[PDB]
Amino acid sequence: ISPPPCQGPIEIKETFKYINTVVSCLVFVLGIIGNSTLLYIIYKNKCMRNGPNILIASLALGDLLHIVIAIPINVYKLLAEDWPFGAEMCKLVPFIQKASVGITVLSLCALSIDRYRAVASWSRIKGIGVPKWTAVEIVLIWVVSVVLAVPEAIGFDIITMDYKGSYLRICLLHPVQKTAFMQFYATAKDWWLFSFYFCLPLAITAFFYTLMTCEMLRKNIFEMLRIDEGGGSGGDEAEKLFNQDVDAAVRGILRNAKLKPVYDSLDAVRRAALINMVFQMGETGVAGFTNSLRMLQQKRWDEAAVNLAKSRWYNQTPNRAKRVITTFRTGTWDAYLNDHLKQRREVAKTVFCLVLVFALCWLPLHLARILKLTLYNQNDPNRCELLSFLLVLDYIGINMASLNSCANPIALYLVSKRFKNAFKSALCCW
Ligand SMILES: COc1ccccc1Oc1c(NS(=O)(=O)c2ccc(C(C)(C)C)cc2)nc(-c2ncccn2)nc1OCCC(=O)Nc1c(C)cccc1C
Ligand SMILES: CC(C)CCC[C@@H](C)[C@H]1CC[C@H]2[C@@H]3CC=C4C[C@@H](O)CC[C@]4(C)[C@H]3CC[C@]12C
Ligand SMILES: CCCCCCCC/C=C\CCCCCCCC(=O)OC[C@H](O)CO
Ligand SMILES: CCCCCCCC/C=C\CCCCCCCC(=O)OC[C@H](O)CO
Ligand SMILES: CCCCCCCC/C=C\CCCCCCCC(=O)OC[C@H](O)CO
Ligand SMILES: CCCCCCCC/C=C\CCCCCCCC(=O)OC[C@H](O)CO
Ligand SMILES: CCCCCCCC/C=C\CCCCCCCC(=O)OC[C@H](O)CO
Ligand SMILES: CCCCCCCC/C=C\CCCCCCCC(=O)OC[C@H](O)CO
Ligand SMILES: CCCCCCCC/C=C\CCCCCCCC(=O)OC[C@H](O)CO
Ligand SMILES: CCCCCCCC/C=C\CCCCCCCC(=O)OC[C@H](O)CO
Ligand SMILES: CCCCCCCC/C=C\CCCCCCCC(=O)OC[C@H](O)CO
């Protein structure tokens, strides 16, 4: 017997009824096949199961449970223009959904941490089967996500709304909560969702991804020099001593006037090539390539490559010079590519892609909720026009956030050739 009143929302809600229904059905089909296939693939590859990619199976299973339970209910609700179900279903759907993105949030954090740990060591000796502590991680992730979603199950209920004489059943977080905690949860829910399900995963994953790429860069520079010196051995002690020589070499470069401008201007990979040269000829010898240094300062890669090729250094040690100059030219590790550098590159790509896909899928909806919280005043005279914009962004945000439930298998297919090959075997060859 409770009502609402305006103008702008009406046609947007009706217009988006078909958009929301189509996106949900798309997510349902793409998500059901992609995540089932992903689970199938991950557990079968015993070298995958050995390590961090078992957390990706946790991702896929959590999204699968949301897809099979919550999305059909939402489709029925959209078409019915009412909540046709009972109170139990009203409590179940938001509980399942909140638990599922919690599993996604914590799995992505765990994946970025475990990838960082793997990079930090030399001569990694893997065990057989799922590592015991990764299994503990999975249980903990799922238990915490479920406990955090419990308030949805407690708070949601069915109420009847009267809209201009028409009665509608609506499933929502009940306006009156019984306990003081549940009343606090209702007031704080919107900020809490932004904090735990958006800010926390971005903070954890950005930090550990950054640590991981920094250690990958040091190991790649270490292998670059060892390969160019005819061979050598890695390990924590060997790397630490080498890193001190690198740090000292960069300290020298920053105190020499010819080298600092080109060094500061260069990217990380191209700085390694310049450090490589400093290791071979010393600091003053590198300063001699004024024309070449100028070209690298002005980003003339091909031009700089030719000038370096025409040098005494090139004549004496051509094989090393060719590799160094390719590094300058491409800004990649392709000339020094071995299995270690190959595996480091694939690892960085998959973690980066999954986190970025999560962030972009969810950012519009979180931005919706925030703008509505801070800005929407119904007491402001032009109340209905601002609502129209927020309602449209909220609808877009809902569909884009929903896409993340099916996006990870597709992203893995597109980014990792290992996963792409495994996808083809399971689907195209079945
Ligand atoms: C961490 O979680 C969030 C963080 C920040 C903001 C929102 C967050 O989560 C939500 C979200 N949360 S909610 O507002 O508490 C809510 C949940 C369920 C329900 C019914 C349907 C049971 C009555 C009504 C309201 N609501 C919707 C929503 N979608 C459609 C209509 C009404 N509401 N979408 C979200 O994410 C979109 C992705 C998604 O998967 N949504 C979804 C889908 C696609 C189907 C079913 C249920 C849901 C929540
Ligand atoms: C694998 C992918 C491409 C399949 C896509 C399935 C989508 C497009 C299908 C599945 C269910 C379908 C909906 C089911 C019922 C209705 C209600 C009707 O009043 C309008 C059409 C509408 C809204 C359909 C639109 C198309 C639809 C959403
Ligand atoms: C890449 C994935 C391929 C698969 C895609 C499957 C086919 C979807 C095609 C059309 C559905 C479009 C539905 C969304 C449009 C809703 C119509 C609408 O809102 O119309 C309002 C009207 O203009 C007010 O008068
Ligand atoms: C794999 C993990 C997934 C976990 C999924 C849990 C599913 C069961 C829970 C709620 C469904 C409710 C069904 C709605 C029908 C209600 C009928 C009824 O009245 O009885 C049940 C109620 O608990 C007493 O009345
Ligand atoms: C991704 C899907 C999540 C994984 C599967 C989910 C876990 C299912 C196991 C136990 C249910 C949770 C047990 C605690 C939740 C029940 C609490 C509750 O329902 O409260 C009733 C409320 O008080 C009435 O008003
Ligand atoms: C792997 C390890 C698995 C560990 C598994 C942990 C499961 C959840 C534990 C604590 C969360 C519960 C904390 C909240 C307690 C609520 C107390 C309560 O229910 O209060 C009654 C209420 O006051 C009457 O109306
Ligand atoms: C294959 C599926 C895998 C699914 C794996 C999921 C693991 C969930 C395990 C324990 C969570 C139990 C949560 C218990 C929450 C206790 C607090 C509570 O229930 O509060 C109700 C409130 O008191 C009413 O008024
Ligand atoms: C690595 C360090 C991470 C540390 C672990 C962080 C995990 C949770 C994240 C944010 C906490 C939630 C903050 C949100 C506060 C609840 C909502 C609120 O602000 O309630 C007050 C209300 O606005 C009055 O009107
Ligand atoms: C120097 C050490 C600091 C290192 C930091 C790393 C930890 C960051 C992790 C989570 C932060 C999440 C913060 C979420 C902020 C939103 C909370 C908020 O805005 O409060 C609501 C509103 O203001 C009330 O009315
Ligand atoms: C592309 C199809 C878009 C469909 C509709 C929008 C859906 C929005 C969700 C995700 C899009 C963003 C995903 C971006 C992933 C980038 C991965 C990447 O950049 O590769 C890593 C490498 O290190 C450098 O390329
Ligand atoms: C996953 C991506 C989700 C898909 C997102 C696609 C972008 C939707 C933008 C505008 C459509 C709705 C705009 C409605 C603005 C006009 C509302 C109105 O009242 O117009 C009535 C007339 O029939 C028509 O304009």
From Swiss-Prot:
Consequence when changing C429S: Abolishes palmitoylation
Purpose of the protein: Non-specific receptor for endothelin 1, 2, and 3. Mediates its action by association with G proteins that activate a phosphatidylinositol-calcium second messenger system.
Clinical disorder: Waardenburg syndrome 4A: A disorder characterized by the association of Waardenburg features (depigmentation and deafness) with the absence of enteric ganglia in the distal part of the intestine (Hirschsprung disease).
Tissue expression notes: Expressed in placental stem villi vessels, but not in cultured placental villi smooth muscle cells.
Membrane topology: Multi-pass membrane protein
UniProt name for this protein: Endothelin receptor type B
Impact reported for R345W: In HSCR2; sporadic
Effect after changing M400I: In HSCR2; decreased calcium release; no effect on cell membrane location
Location, primary (coarse class): membrane
Lineage, broadest ranks: Eukaryota, Metazoa, Chordata, Craniata, Vertebrata
Residues anchoring lipid (S-palmitoyl cysteine): C428, C429
GO BP of this protein: aldosterone metabolic process; calcium ion transmembrane transport; calcium-mediated signaling; canonical Wnt signaling pathway; cell surface receptor signaling pathway; cellular response to lipopolysaccharide; cGMP-mediated signaling; chordate pharynx development
Cystine pairings recorded for this chain: C90-C171
Membrane-crossing residue ranges in chain numbering: 18-42, 54-79, 92-113, 135-159, 188-212, 351-376, 389-415
Ranges facing Cytoplasmic side: 43-53, 114-134, 213-350
Sequence similarity: Belongs to the G-protein coupled receptor 1 family. Endothelin receptor subfamily. EDNRB sub-subfamily.
Compartment list: Cell membrane
Stretches of the chain found on the membrane's Extracellular side: 80-91, 160-187, 377-388
Entire protein: shown range: 85 to 404 of 442
Gene Ontology MF annotations: endothelin receptor activity; peptide hormone binding; type 1 angiotensin receptor binding
GO cellular component: nuclear membrane; plasma membrane
Assigned keywords, A-Z: Albinism, Cell membrane, Deafness, Disease variant, Disulfide bond, G-protein coupled receptor, Glycoprotein, Hirschsprung disease, Lipoprotein, Membrane, Palmitate, Phosphoprotein, Receptor, Signal, Transducer, Transmembrane, Transmembrane helix, Waardenburg syndrome
